[PDB]
Symmetry: D2
Subunit: 116 residues, 4 copies
């Protein structure tokens, strides 16, 4: 609910289906602690990662396993993964969508942050 | 149903709301004929542009009125509009989403084409 | 010199070489008048389109022939071209670089505008 | 020379000047070892990070300090940095250009890889 990830494929013109996504939260010692993870659905979307209670302010990293995605399609990739690192700030009610558009040698990412 | 447009704002991190979108189909004389149009909703989406019966194969242009969008936000823009020109090809059942991510001096667009 | 175009290939991670580019300028009767054209070099760059004298104020359209590029690589892409439409030199001469990043179902474009 | 970084600003339509960039290389114990760092110039480019001798095969992370860039412009952005993680030189030396296009809530990155 508070955090959704959506992944699209710029080569095939499709959702990026069955992509592994890991979310980490930065710990006090500056290490990355696993927070949530899953695989994108047939729509390219990954829902249900966290809850309002669990998602507190902090620094988060979303790692999208793009290399494995491209390899499963038989397409030669450049990156190991796509990484999105951001701060969650409580500024009234907010829902976050982290969206990524994947190509073999490029990616784009945006945040769509809305007030429900 | 067969054609949806979605527009996002990379500066504000939001859907691009109330953006005018025009769709044209290329005529035999190479001119662009108005085909459908509307304004994006609060989700950034524009549904209901056309019907399965009306949307035939051909060359289409989607013009997204980005300059007016940025001006309404008080942000100085570069482009007059964003233009997406593509061929619709009947290759089994297909639904098209034309998505765009807007910045003042840049835009990105992709097509998400799925079989319902 | 005042107008340069650069095109990159997001599948191969390379310059997009031998891409045709056509520049138009909106005429007083609202038609698109041919202005300049050329092909990208081995670096993906297209220099020498115009001159300071010829590049007057106006609304310009840069059409990048992405479909012909993909077809030459044996790929059937989604878009016919990538189009960049902008007002130029409205506050005196500027140098414009129009850059594009290509995938079969997506493109991104940015402008870099500098004052000499 | 073998590794160059270029950063552009999609709000202003300009090179992103004075952007800090830190490159790491994955060590045999799976930690990220510092490798090279620098700042983009007035053209948005960062040359001279490394040498052919030092740039061995490995997994590299290029961290572009986008938050510090935006904060210096008086903007509160979404991301902490932009991260580009890739295996380099796996089939012999290549020249890599890592390019990034920045907005407050989005970034795009591409790689241009050439064989000398
Ligand atoms: C089809 O549906 C969607 C598509 C897209 C995108 O195509 C998109 C994704 C990332 C980037 C950096 C840029 C683009 C244009 C995002 C969406 N979303 O809701 O953010 C979305 O729903
Ligand atoms: C003006 O000069 C350059 C521009 C650009 C880009 O505009 C570009 C950058 C990132 C992305 C994701 C997409 C785009 C189109 C890249 C360059 N390069 O060498 O990669 C370059 O030289």
């Amino acid at each position: 609910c508070p955090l959704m990830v959506k992944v699209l494929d710029a080569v095939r013109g499709s959702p990026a289906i069955n992509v592994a996504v890991h979310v980490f939260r930065k710990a006090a010692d500056d290490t990355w602690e696993p927070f949530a993870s899953g695989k994108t659905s047939e729509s390219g979307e990954l829902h249900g990662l966290t809850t309002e209670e669990e998602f507190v302010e902090g620094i988060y990293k979303v790692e999208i396993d793009t290399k494995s995605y491209w390899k499963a399609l038989g397409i030669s990739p450049f990156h190991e993964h796509a990484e999105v690192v951001f701060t969650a700030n409580d500024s009234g009610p907010r829902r976050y969508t982290i969206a990524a558009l994947l190509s073999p040698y490029s990616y784009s990412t945006t945040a769509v942050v809305t007030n429900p």
